[PDB]
Write a protein that holds these residues in place. Structure first.
Motif, PDB file in Angstrom:
ATOM      1  N   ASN E  31      -0.801 -12.371  -1.621  1.00 27.26           N
ATOM      2  CA  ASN E  31       0.379 -12.176  -1.312  1.00 27.26           C
ATOM      3  C   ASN E  31       1.564 -11.441  -2.510  1.00 27.26           C
ATOM      4  O   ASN E  31       0.734 -10.629  -3.036  1.00 27.26           O
ATOM      5  N   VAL E  33       2.951 -12.176  -4.932  1.00 22.27           N
ATOM      6  CA  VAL E  33       2.870 -12.996  -5.995  1.00 22.27           C
ATOM      7  C   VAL E  33       4.722 -13.488  -6.285  1.00 22.27           C
ATOM      8  O   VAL E  33       5.112 -13.084  -7.265  1.00 22.27           O
ATOM      9  N   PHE E  34       4.980 -14.393  -5.318  1.00 23.18           N
ATOM     10  CA  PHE E  34       6.345 -14.963  -5.324  1.00 23.18           C
ATOM     11  C   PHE E  34       7.331 -13.725  -5.116  1.00 23.18           C
ATOM     12  O   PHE E  34       7.271 -12.787  -5.497  1.00 23.18           O
ATOM     13  N   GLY E  35       8.257 -14.062  -4.315  1.00 26.91           N
ATOM     14  CA  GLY E  35       9.325 -13.038  -3.966  1.00 26.91           C
ATOM     15  C   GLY E  35       8.926 -11.874  -3.306  1.00 26.91           C
ATOM     16  O   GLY E  35       8.070 -11.196  -3.877  1.00 26.91           O
ATOM     17  N   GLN E  36       9.462 -11.700  -2.052  1.00 25.08           N
ATOM     18  CA  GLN E  36       9.194 -10.572  -1.100  1.00 25.08           C
ATOM     19  C   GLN E  36       9.288  -9.236  -1.972  1.00 25.08           C
ATOM     20  O   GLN E  36       9.016  -8.140  -1.344  1.00 25.08           O
ATOM     21  N   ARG E  41      10.116  -3.947  -6.336  1.00 19.75           N
ATOM     22  CA  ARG E  41       9.571  -4.531  -7.486  1.00 19.75           C
ATOM     23  C   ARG E  41       8.851  -3.684  -8.428  1.00 19.75           C
ATOM     24  O   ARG E  41       7.920  -2.971  -7.903  1.00 19.75           O
ATOM     25  N   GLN E  45       4.610  -7.100 -12.928  1.00 17.46           N
ATOM     26  CA  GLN E  45       5.403  -8.580 -12.458  1.00 17.46           C
ATOM     27  C   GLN E  45       5.314  -8.353 -11.180  1.00 17.46           C
ATOM     28  O   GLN E  45       5.706  -9.448 -10.848  1.00 17.46           O
ATOM     29  N   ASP E  65       4.993  -3.359   4.243  1.00 15.74           N
ATOM     30  CA  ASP E  65       5.751  -3.265   5.298  1.00 15.74           C
ATOM     31  C   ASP E  65       7.276  -2.995   5.337  1.00 15.74           C
ATOM     32  O   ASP E  65       8.021  -3.716   5.880  1.00 15.74           O
ATOM     33  N   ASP E  66       7.380  -1.778   4.857  1.00 11.42           N
ATOM     34  CA  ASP E  66       8.662  -1.270   4.636  1.00 11.42           C
ATOM     35  C   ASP E  66       9.104   0.086   5.104  1.00 11.42           C
ATOM     36  O   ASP E  66       8.226   0.996   4.827  1.00 11.42           O
ATOM     37  N   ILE E  67       9.832   0.291   6.217  1.00 11.14           N
ATOM     38  CA  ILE E  67      10.134   1.688   6.647  1.00 11.14           C
ATOM     39  C   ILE E  67      11.156   2.631   5.792  1.00 11.14           C
ATOM     40  O   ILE E  67      11.716   2.272   5.084  1.00 11.14           O
TER      41      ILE E  67
END
Lengths: 162, 653, 494, 159, 84
Positions: E31, E33-36, E41, E45, E65-67
């Motif tokens: 995933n 690692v906590f926080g999308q 990021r 970290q 998955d970011d436009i």
């Protein structure tokens, strides 16, 4: 006919060929089973053999031969067990639960046990979809054999082969 | 045994000559029974005692020595009816059910032993079938005597006489005729007479045609003889059981088959009459929560849930499923935990398990050893499952769930069974959120454990609350004042039934109906409409997240919207979707998005004090230090401690 | 055709532990608590058959040295009698003997109770040791004769006709409350709750569907050093059927119905938890916080549907526990953990708490007068070496619960509805939630409990006043310190 | 014809492959359908396509229902065989396919099966259980008619 | 760590004491690692599972998955065409 899942069976289907189908668990561990007794006499020689009839021998019920070894069949000649000429058929039993998806209600599953003779052994891991076939056999006394009664429970049944 | 001839002659004369004006009830009971291949007979004692008092005088005297002479007596009759000559024909079982006088379970103490006793209790569990014997051949180990023993009933040892001895007789199983047996075990009814003590349970043996006649948990009234068996466990201490002849279930109590994939006729009629209602959807949405007020979005969502959805088997092996999921999460007074109890009632096959499951049954599919022990996800396959405390479920099976809900199949590798079954269930979960309203002030996600992924899998997430409005609060209150007494409010539902609303006893049959009959399909303009929908969603909400606004959008959500459209299409029952039909769905799910959308004191978060001037090495402290320091400080929760920790971890302090 | 005589008290009166060989074959009285009893298994007794030897009596108990046709069976039951715990001399274990009941004596006994038995003493026959003894040692079994309770209370014509005239004064209520927990010095509130729940409610089944609930579940939320334990202990002495389950760990019974293998070697007997055992009575539990979830689910279920369902092993039922739960709970950490709300104050989750109608919260600090008032009471106690006599109250309660079923009349009681509104909306501005229509229903039920104390046969405005004060102050005292703001509107409710 | 059983009988799909190419596909953007394409067709249209041609337009590949495994399994235990599962139409259907392909062999087979059901259906003609569920629709209809003659003759038998 | 690079497994258990060979290839999906905060990021970290593991894996691929807006529409169209 005789098409039955294990849930629908007993007794009209007993002593009659049957094709069960369901899940197999837990698959009892593979083990040898003695059949043909073979021995060697000396110095009288020849070749001496006994034939052991178990509960699952052939199909039909027969006066039980077992157990141990003939050990000085007449006359008094010594008989040593000849291993590796004598015949051992492998033997196993595996219980079969009815298919989980065709279960009617929260009513508990009813499984019956299938003995797998010879080659059939180790042909199936547990948890596998299986359609067994076999003759439906009732073996063991129901307690009627002895003289204690015990209870009303009796005549455990299983399928030979196949 | 001329006496047995004398008794059997009387039983034949009772079957052939009996006349209720003018058909012979028994004699035809017989024929109509052999034709269907039932091989049984049910005597009505009142007719019996009417016919001769005498034979009932002996039959209530020594039943177990007589009743089998009655069996042979009747099968000797079916020989003259069912066939004619100048095989094989089993000796029929007789089942006699009669009024008499009910003898409660507690009041059975000796003294009536071997005297027919009618009684009443709820069956606990049914024991697995096993065969007794009826006719078995026997050969000797030595002289090879061929003996055909007719065993009756009415335990029985084998004869030793044709060294020879002591008991040289073998059972030939190739020719032996066998019957079946059950072992019910029944707990007396909870109404009377438990008092302060746990109710006793007498063990009962059903046999032949009464076997599997009764589902465990259904109230019944047994007749049968009362008798005792040994079963070493002194001295002498023989333990009590009730042989059953014959069993009769109560008229209502799951007599079966309450689940028939076809139902009746007049039902298709009135259903197809209900499909013609314009307010059909609207009136259904009023059926679910007669008691529960407000919450219309939830109220409709239940409906679209129950009805299933598009199910595709299309190649390749990958199969999309239905129908969706629903989250009721919110502070108490939401009635969600009651609402679930309701869905559980309505849904055709449903299992309410809040856990962690409950009590001894594992949360759904469960491995137990002699195999699948059958559970929620299993025992309740092909339908609705109701879960609570969704966030409070164990880890190992949480994995199982997460993997299950999408592909409908759970794989179990435990021990000697590696099975890969199938859960077609659609999970409806009500989570409990933490710390209250501030969790709304907090990012909308981030609630469940450390991970939002749960909320990603779930299609319809409804944040709710026990909102209070003097208008609405007076509504609910006044309603309760009405509820207590003078009592008569629950009638409004009934006049809703006369005029419009559905009895909910019918709603269920309806749901089954629609569920099996028709599988809906969407229209193209509706499709492109939803394309526009989802691209506007993606684009706009991306633009919203340019600022890194903390919250989401998956194509899974789209697929949800779809499944809602097919669900509601399956309400109308139509084979085809329409545009407006979907136009509802978009907005409904839009309310769900509004639910997806929705400072800190920092007091606890002030872990700085400790980290500093307390511990530069952090050691000798860690989660442990925070405790002792916040253990007797009246202060720190697990999530609180971690939150402030994770917070500061992230914050960079 | 047989009547065996019972033969009342026969001193002797020798202690259970005090027994010797001199007592063999000679009738001797014994006394002590019953321990769980075997189920009723018909014994052989007389032998008879159609021929085909004659009738053979066997036996007590040998059977040496089977046919059956019509044999006269007589129920057998073996119960293990243990010596009473109170009467045990220090440094000694409570030795116990086997007891054999016969015929009607069967089922007269129940586990947990002290019983007076006249049975004769017996031995036979070794029997079975011969392996670990070293010696020819016989078994010790008292074949029982009669059964009596210890050594019982009920209402009576003269006592009730006398009785009725007492319940007529209005102030009897307050007098009773003052009588309800004498040695604690207590509070007027926390005892009031006790009296209310202990005294009763109306079940009350709506034809034909749902019975609501006829009981009051008291959450007594204590504080270290507060009386919170002792109070409920009173309830075990006074109430008719009252059961003490403690938290867990356990002081038997252990709160969860389960079918368990029996001690020594015996068939499997079903057993209820405290809940089933205490049905119609009062269930008394303390330290919820220390309870393992396995129990927690059981209590929750019991409160929810008023029945415990057991699915194991083959036995499948729903037993019915209608018990009123009275609880003692310990706030997380300190006396008052925070200004923060009660649900935040203590560990128990809010939904299990919602089931409890009355919450008794103790607080908060000492004081001149309070120390006076207390010290006088304690000193009074140790020096020892208006309220009703305890006996007549503990009869009073039972009497009223059995006989009277008060009822409200629809005409003038509509007022209550208004009250609810008056409470509801104005309470929404501050604090959450907790108020709900449930919390309305508890008003009515509690009110009619007071109607039972009045022996009133119907609900009156006084009863309402009392009730509303009870529930409303209960709700007040749960909330955060902002509830001070609440207090100002309580005046009209007062 | 007008009865519902026949017009419903024609509704059933058959695996019939085309002998020829046919542009102007009415089923999608082929436009023609390539030769020897296997397309399921209901019986109504497929019935005269095997006649009109001197080579017919369609091969008439034998339906899975008539698979020799089935026609074999119905020779063992018809009475316990479930017809209602496979089609469900059999006699309404099979009657057409025996004429269409002019197969003699199976006549003697189905002519037997239908006696064997009926020697069982005069058995449930006397006044179900599970069995009534596995009959073919039309056969079922005959069960109504018989059971009704019997019921009515019994209700006339007494008062 | 011992499995991946070293390529062998070592069992000193109780016991049977042996070095047995597992030379498997490995894929792993984790995933954010906590926080999308996986997209924006920091390069560190974000992974959440230091350290040598990060190295052991030959390739670390990122999937935000970011436009990429013009990329979203295309994906949607593709999915639509697939739904058939």
């Amino acid at each position: 006919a005789h098409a039955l899942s294990p849930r629908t069976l007993t007794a009209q289907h007993l002593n009659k060929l049957v094709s069960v189908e369901g899940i197999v668990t837990k698959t009892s561990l593979v083990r040898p089973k003695l059949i043909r007794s073979v021995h060697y006499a000396a110095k009288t020689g020849r070749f001496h053999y006994r034939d052991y009839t178990d509960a699952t021998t052939t199909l039909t019920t027969r006066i039980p031969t077992p157990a141990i070894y003939p050990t000085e069949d007449t006359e008094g000649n010594k008989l040593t067990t000849e291993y590796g000429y004598s015949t051992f058929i492998d033997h196993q039993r595996i219980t079969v639960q009815e298919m989980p998806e065709m279960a009617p209600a929260g009513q508990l599953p009813r499984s019956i046990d299938v003995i797998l003779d010879d080659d059939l052994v180790d042909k199936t891991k547990p948890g596998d979809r299986v359609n067994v076939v076999g003759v439906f056999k009732s073996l063991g006394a129901g307690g009627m054999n002895q003289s204690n009664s015990n209870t009303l429970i009796g005549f455990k049944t299983l399928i030979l082969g196949n | 045994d001329d006496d047995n001839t004398e008794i059997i002659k009387s039983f034949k004369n009772f079957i052939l000559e009996f006349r209720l004006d003018s058909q012979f009830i028994y004699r035809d009971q017989l024929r109509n029974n052999i034709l269907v291949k039932n091989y049984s007979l049910t005597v009505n004692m009142e007719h019996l005692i009417g016919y001769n008092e005498d034979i009932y005088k002996k039959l209530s005297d020594e039943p177990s020595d007589i009743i089998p002479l009655f069996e042979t007596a009747i099968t000797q009759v079916a020989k003259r009816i069912s066939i004619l000559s100048r095989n094989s024909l089993p000796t029929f079982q007789l089942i006699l059910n009669s009024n008499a006088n009910q003898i409660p379970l507690r009041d059975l103490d000796s003294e009536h032993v071997s005297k027919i006793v009618r009684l009443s209790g709820i069956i606990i569990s049914t024991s697995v079938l096993s065969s007794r014997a009826t006719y078995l051949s026997i050969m000797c180990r030595n002289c090879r005597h061929t003996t055909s023993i007719t065993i009756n009933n009415f335990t029985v040892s084998l004869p030793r006489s044709c060294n020879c001895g002591p008991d040289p007789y073998i059972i030939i199983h190739e020719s032996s005729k066998f019957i079946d047996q059950q072992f019910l075990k029944l707990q007396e009814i909870p109404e009377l007479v438990p008092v302060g003590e746990m109710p006793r349970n007498l063990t009962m043996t059903c046999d032949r045609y009464l076997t599997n006649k009764v589902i465990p948990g259904t109230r019944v009234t047994i007749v049968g003889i009362y008798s005792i068996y040994n079963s070493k466990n002194g001295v002498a201490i023989r333990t009590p059981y009730i042989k059953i002849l014959g069993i009769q279930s109560d008229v209502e109590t799951s007599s079966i088959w309450n689940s028939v994939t076809m139902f009746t006729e007049e039902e298709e009629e009135e259903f197809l009459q209900l499909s013609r209602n314009p307010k059909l959807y609207e009136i259904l949405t009023n059926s679910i929560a007669p008691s529960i007020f407000g919450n219309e979005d939830i109220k409709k969502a239940i409906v679209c849930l129950l009805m299933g959805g598009s199910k595709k088997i299309l190649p390749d092996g990958m199969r999309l499923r239905g129908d969706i999921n629903v989250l009721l999460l919110g502070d108490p007074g939401t009635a969600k935990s009651q609402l679930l109890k309701f869905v559980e009632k309505v849904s055709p096959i449903a299992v309410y398990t809040s856990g962690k499951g409950s009590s001894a049954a594992g949360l759904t599919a469960s491995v137990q050893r002699d195999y699948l022990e059958g559970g929620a996800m299993v025992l309740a396959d092909g339908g609705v499952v109701c879960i609570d405390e969704f966030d409070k479920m164990r880890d190992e099976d949480r994995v199982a769930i997460h993997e299950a809900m999408e592909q409908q199949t759970i794989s179990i590798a435990k021990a000697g069974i590696t099975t890969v079954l199938n859960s077609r269930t659609s999970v409806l979960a009500a989570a409990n959120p933490i710390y209250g309203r501030y969790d709304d002030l907090k990012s909308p996600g981030d609630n469940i454990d450390f991970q939002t992924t749960i909320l990603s899998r779930f299609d319809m997430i409804f944040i709710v609350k026990d909102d209070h409005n003097e208008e609405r609060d007076i509504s609910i209150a006044n309603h309760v004042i009405n509820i207590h007494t003078g009592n008569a409010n629950a009638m409004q539902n009934q006049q809703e039934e006369n005029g419009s609303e559905i009895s909910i006893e019918k709603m269920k049959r309806y749901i089954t109906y629609c569920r099996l009959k028709c599988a809906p399909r969407l229209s193209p303009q509706a499709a492109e409409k939803l394309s526009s929908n989802f691209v506007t969603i993606r684009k706009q909400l991306l633009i919203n997240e340019l600022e890194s606004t903390e919250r989401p959008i998956t194509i899974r959500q789209l697929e949800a919207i779809i499944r809602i459209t097919e669900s509601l299409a399956k309400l109308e029952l139509s084979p085809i979707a329409q545009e407006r039909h979907v136009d509802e769905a978009i907005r409904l799910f839009q309310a769900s998005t509004m639910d997806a959308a929705s400072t800190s004191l920092s007091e606890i978060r002030r872990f700085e004090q400790e980290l500093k001037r307390r511990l530069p090495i952090g050691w000798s402290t860690s989660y442990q230090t925070l405790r002792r320091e916040f253990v007797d400080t009246h202060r720190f929760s697990q999530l609180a401690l971690d939150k402030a920790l994770y917070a500061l971890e992230k914050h960079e302090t | 055709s047989e009547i065996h005589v019972r033969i009342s008290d026969f001193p002797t009166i020798y202690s259970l532990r005090e027994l010797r060989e001199s007592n063999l074959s000679s009738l001797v009285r014994v006394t002590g608590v019953v321990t769980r009893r075997t189920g009723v298994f018909p014994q052989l007794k007389y032998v008879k058959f159609n021929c085909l030897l004659g009738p053979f009596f066997q036996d007590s108990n040998e059977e040496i040295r089977v046919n059956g046709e019509k044999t006269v069976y007589r129920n057998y039951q073996r119960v293990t009698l243990q010596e009473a715990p109170g009467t045990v001399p220090p440094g000694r274990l409570p030795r116990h003997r086997e007891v054999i009941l016969l015929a009607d004596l069967v089922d007269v006994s129940k586990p947990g109770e002290e019983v007076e038995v006249t049975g004769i003493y017996k031995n036979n026959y070794d029997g079975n040791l011969n392996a670990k003894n070293g010696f020819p040692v016989f078994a010790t079994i008292i074949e029982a004769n009669s059964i009596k309770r210890r050594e019982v209370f009920s209402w009576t014509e003269e006592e009730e006709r006398e009785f009725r005239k007492i319940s007529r004064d209005r102030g009897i209520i307050d007098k009773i409350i003052s009588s309800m927990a004498p040695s604690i010095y207590g509070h007027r509130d926390i005892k009031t709750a006790v009296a209310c729940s202990l005294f009763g409610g109306v079940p009350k089944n709506v034809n034909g569907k749902h019975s609501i609930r006829g009981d009051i579940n008291v959450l007594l939320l204590g504080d270290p050093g507060t009386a919170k334990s002792q109070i409920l202990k009173y309830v075990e002495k006074t109430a008719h059927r009252a059961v003490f389950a403690t938290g867990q760990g356990a002081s038997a019974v252990g709160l969860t119905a389960s079918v368990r293998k029996d001690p020594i070697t015996k068939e499997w007997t079903l057993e209820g938890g405290a809940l089933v055992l205490a049905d119609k009575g009062v269930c008394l539990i303390d330290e919820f916080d220390k309870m393992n979830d396995q129990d927690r689910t059981s209590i929750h279920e019991a409160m929810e549907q008023q029945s415990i369902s057991i699915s194991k092993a083959g036995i499948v039922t729903t037993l019915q526990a209608r018990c009123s739960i009275i609880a003692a709970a310990n706030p997380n950490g300190g006396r008052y953990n925070s200004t923060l709300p009660l649900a935040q104050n203590v560990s128990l989750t809010e939904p299990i708490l919602s089931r409890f109608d009355i919450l008794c919260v103790v607080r908060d600090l000492v004081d001149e007068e309070a120390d006076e008032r207390l010290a006088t009471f304690v000193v009074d106690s140790h020096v020892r070496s208006s309220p009703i006599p305890q006996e007549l109250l503990m009869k009073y309660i039972h009497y009223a619960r059995t006989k009277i079923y008060p009822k409200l009349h629809q005409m003038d009681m509509d007022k209550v509805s208004r009250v609810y509104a008056d409470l509801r909306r104005e309470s929404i501005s501050t604090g959450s939630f907790p108020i709900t229509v449930r919390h309305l229903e508890s008003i009515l039920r509690i009110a009619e409990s007071f109607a039972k104390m009045r022996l009133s046969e119907f609900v009156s405005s006084y009863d309402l006043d009392r009730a509303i004060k009870v529930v409303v102050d209960s709700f007040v005292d749960a909330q955060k310190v902002s509830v001070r703001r609440q207090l100002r509107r309580s005046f009209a409710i007062y | 014809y007008y009865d519902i059983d026949d017009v419903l009988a024609d509704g059933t799909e058959f695996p019939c492959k085309f002998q020829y190419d046919i542009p102007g596909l009415g089923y999608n953007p082929g436009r023609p359908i390539t030769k020897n394409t296997k397309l399921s067709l209901p019986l109504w249209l497929a019935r005269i396509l095997a006649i009109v041609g001197p080579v017919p337009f369609v091969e008439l590949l034998p339906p899975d229902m008539f698979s020799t495994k089935v026609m074999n399994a119905i020779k063992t235990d018809p009475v316990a065989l479930d017809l209602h599962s496979i089609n469900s139409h059999f006699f309404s259907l099979a009657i057409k396919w025996i004429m269409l392909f002019s197969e003699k062999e199976l006549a003697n087979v189905v002519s037997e099966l239908l006696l064997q059901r009926a020697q069982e259906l005069n058995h449930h003609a006397s006044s179900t259980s599970t069995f009534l569920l596995k009959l073919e629709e039309m056969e079922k209809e005959i069960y109504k008619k018989s059971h009704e003659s019997y019921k009515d003759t019994k209700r006339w038998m007494f008062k | 760590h011992e499995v991946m690079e070293q390529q062998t497994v070592t069992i000193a258990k109780a016991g049977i004491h042996t070095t047995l060979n597992a030379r498997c290839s490995v894929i792993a999906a984790a995933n954010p690692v906590f926080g999308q905060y996986d997209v924006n990021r920091d390069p560190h970290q974000n992974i959440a599972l230091p350290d040598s593991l990060l190295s052991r894996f030959d390739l670390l691929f990122v999937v935000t998955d970011d436009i990429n807006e013009i990329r979203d529409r295309s994906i949607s169209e593709h999915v639509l065409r697939t739904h058939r």
